Amino acid sequence: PRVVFIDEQSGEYAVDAQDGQSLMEVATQNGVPGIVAECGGSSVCATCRIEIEDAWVEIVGEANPDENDLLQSTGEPMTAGTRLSCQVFIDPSMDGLIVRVPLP
Amino acid sequence: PRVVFIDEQSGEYAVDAQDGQSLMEVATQNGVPGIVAECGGSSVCATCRIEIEDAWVEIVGEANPDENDLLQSTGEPMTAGTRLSCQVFIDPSMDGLIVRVPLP
Ligand code: FES
Numbered sequence: 001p002r003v004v005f006i007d008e009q010s011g012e013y014a015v016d017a018q019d020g021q022s023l024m025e026v027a028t029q030n031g032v033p034g035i036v037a038e039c040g041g042s043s044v045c046a047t048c049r050i051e052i053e054d055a056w057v058e059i060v061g062e063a064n065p066d067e068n069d070l071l072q073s074t075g076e077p078m079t080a081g082t083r084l085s086c087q088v089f090i091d092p093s094m095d096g097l098i099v100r101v102p103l104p
Numbered sequence: 105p106r107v108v109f110i111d112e113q114s115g116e117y118a119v120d121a122q123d124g125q126s127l128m129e130v131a132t133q134n135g136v137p138g139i140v141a142e143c144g145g146s147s148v149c150a151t152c153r154i155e156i157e158d159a160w161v162e163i164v165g166e167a168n169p170d171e172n173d174l175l176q177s178t179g180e181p182m183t184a185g186t187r188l189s190c191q192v193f194i195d196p197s198m199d200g201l202i203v204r205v206p207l208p
């Protein structure tokens with residue numbers, strides 16, 4: 001599936017993901033700046049945090065409870081589309097997904 | 105990933121799924137009774153309906169707008185877990201997923 005990453009300082013990365021890859025894996029494997037897997041997908045580091053662009057927020061689904069716990073406690077206020085990219089796994093429904101990378 | 109289908113009359117089917125299969129595709133390919141894909145995954149026939157069970161309800165996420173609309177229009181019972189299985193796609197987070205198959 002096609003996944004787009006908004007670097008709102010520089011433009012949109014378009015990557016071709018495979019099914020079952022986590023969003024964080026598709027970013028770190030395609031050199032998308034701003035996503036780092038410090039804790040390796042354990043919902044501790046919150047460094048992989050991404051923002052689902054509005055149209056896709058219902059598709060992707062709200063954050064899991066562990067995500068919601070972490071994202072409401074570590075740093076920036078979360079919104080409807082805020083997710084840990086390590087918790088979002090690519091699948092056919094997500095072809096064309098647009099996500100924004102919280103950046104500098 | 106492992107998926108479990110409850111026939112509440114009969115027991116629990118256990119199936120090994122692959123990433124990127126829809127849950128409906130998992131049910132129909134492994135002979136899980138009560139799941140029919142009449143419209144073939146276009147959110148019309150609603151004969152693929154399931155109910156996510158237990159703590160999987162947050163993991164999978166609520167129904168998408170097309171599912172909610174269809175489940176409203178057809179008067180189908182909808183709980184927090186109610187999904188069109190054709191709209192739910194297997195990915196690594198769902199290993200162990202338990203869903204209820206509404207049966208007779
Ligand atoms: S990689 Fe640490 S929270 Fe996602």
Ligand code: FES
Binds near residue numbers: 152191
């Ligand atoms: S197959 Fe018809 S709505 Fe799922």
